[PDB]
């Protein structure tokens, strides 16, 4: 019953497909997508 | 300079992982990103 936000981009759980929770942080699917580009070094 | 940065999700330092991606006062390593992929894709 509270708005949760991606710690990287700031979007809430209501703006993304999925919001993954760490111990005290969160990351959305869009940022994970971006992380893959960074790690794989590809577009 | 010289300071240890940790993945905010698993706690590993930048010397324990391949890459540590930085956000605003938050970090995530390549291993946790791999896990996130399994979570999003809902597969193993
Ligand atoms: Ca040091
Ligand atoms: Zn995000
Ligand atoms: Zn990690």
Swiss-Prot record, chain A:
Transmembrane segments: none annotated. Induction: By heat shock. Part of the clpP-clpX operon, clpX can be expressed individually from its own promoter. Disruption phenotype: Delayed and decreased induction of the extracytoplasmic-stress response. Residues 1-43 form the ClpX-type ZB domain. It comes from the Bacteria. Zn(2+) binds at residues 6, 9, 28, 31. Component of the ClpX-ClpP complex. Forms a hexameric ring that, in the presence of ATP, binds to fourteen ClpP subunits assembled into a disk-like structure with a central cavity, resembling the structure of eukaryotic proteasomes. Interacts with Mu phage DDE-recombinase A; this interaction remodels the viral transpososome for replication. Belongs to the ClpX chaperone family. ATP-dependent specificity component of the Clp protease. Uses cycles of ATP binding and hydrolysis to unfold proteins and translocate them to the ClpP protease. It directs the protease to specific substrates both with and without the help of adapter proteins such as SspB. Participates in the final steps of RseA-sigma-E degradation, liberating sigma-E to induce the extracytoplasmic-stress response. It may bind to the lambda O substrate protein and present it to the ClpP protease in a form that can be recognized and readily hydrolyzed by ClpP. This is ATP-dependent Clp protease ATP-binding subunit ClpX.
């Amino acid at each position: 019953g509270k708005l949760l936000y991606c710690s990287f981009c700031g979007k809430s759980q209501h703006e993304v497909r999925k919001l993954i929770a760490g111990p005290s942080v969160y990351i959305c699917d869009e940022c994970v997508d971006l992380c893959n580009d960074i790690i794989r070094e590809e577009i």
